[PDB]
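testing teh design pipeline on a random one, pls ignore if ur not involved
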């Protein structure tokens, strides 16, 4: 299966996906990395790995639909089967999500359905949980509400900050996102006709 990874930043999840998809038994290959932001470290990681990159600046487009159309054009150019959102921080439009339904994965640094949104660690710390984690899910129109594929719990330690908690949770992210991608790319897991997750 042919994979696009979309990013907005550092790209540690991208790097874990690059490493995993290059193992001999990988059912996924990463054929393009798309960033909505120029000059981010994730683009360096892609170039270093010999993977093509494109920057599609959302601030140059009139609305969300035009931006998504620009993304979609590149996805078609590279005959992409699966899209991974790996620190990509834009909400995708309904029609784009529907087109890629069952074919687009997102990583989120909480145990969904807790702490939906952009600042999950801040929320976790404010709430005072002692267990948080991360989630890979299929992308649905409703943000952070799509079908869950894998999750991993991560403890919150006394005195944690966003810096230390996000660091600990990223260790888990780098495990479950490659695992989830392999499950979907191998056809082991799919979004069922009833919309629920199906293990074949
Ligand atoms: N349809 C849909 N789009 C998705 N994108 C992402 C990937 C994760 C996106 C989380 C971004 C939230 C922070 C943010 O900046 N959101 C808006 C602006 C709202 C605001 O600034 O308060 C935006 O930038 O488009 C996941 C996901 C999903 O499950 N469903
Ligand atoms: N709402 C989505 C979200 O919060 N994504 C989070 O952004 C970080 C990106 O790190 P990276 O650029 O090093 O992969 C990751 O922690 C990811 O789960």
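output:
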């Amino acid at each position: 299966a042919r994979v696009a990874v979309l990013i907005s930043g550092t790209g540690s999840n991208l790097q874990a996906l690059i490493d995993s998809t290059r193992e001999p038994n990988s059912s996924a290959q990463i054929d393009i990395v798309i960033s909505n932001k120029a000059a981010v470290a994730g683009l360096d990681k892609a170039e270093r790995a010999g993977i093509p990159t494109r920057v599609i600046n959302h601030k140059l487009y009139k609305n969300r639909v035009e931006f998504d159309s620009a993304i979609d054009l590149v996805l078609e150019e590279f005959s992409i089967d699966i899209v991974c959102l790996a620190g990509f921080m834009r909400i995708l439009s309904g029609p784009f999500v529907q087109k890629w339904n069952g074919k687009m994965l997102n990583i989120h640094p909480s145990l969904l359905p807790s702490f939906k949104g952009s600042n999950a660690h801040e929320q976790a710390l404010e709430t005072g949980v002692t267990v948080t984690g991360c989630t890979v899910h299929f992308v649905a129109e409703d943000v952070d509400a799509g079908q869950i594929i894998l999750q991993e719990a991560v403890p919150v330690k006394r005195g944690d900050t966003v810096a230390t908690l996000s660091e600990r949770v990223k260790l888990a992210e780098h495990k479950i996102f490659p695992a989830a991608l392999q499950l979907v790319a191998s056809g082991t897991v799919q979004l069922g006709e009833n919309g629920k997750i199906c293990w074949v």
